[PDB]
Amino acid sequence: PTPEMREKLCGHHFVRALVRVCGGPRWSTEA
């Protein structure tokens, strides 16, 4: 929620980014 630059989440990028934002100690299947 800041002037952050959109990262091109191509392939695995989406996955790692998803884990980063949603939460590491939880993506025990959704990643």
Binding site: R6, V21, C22
Partner: peptide, 26 residues
């Protein structure tokens, strides 16, 4: 640009933390 697919959308255009947060589930 536009894309009826988040993974594709994030790849083609790109996604931030906010963008991803909006896609975060329970």
């Amino acid at each position: 640009a536009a894309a009826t697919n988040p993974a594709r959308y994030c790849c083609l255009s790109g996604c931030t933390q906010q963008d991803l947060l909006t896609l975060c589930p329970y």
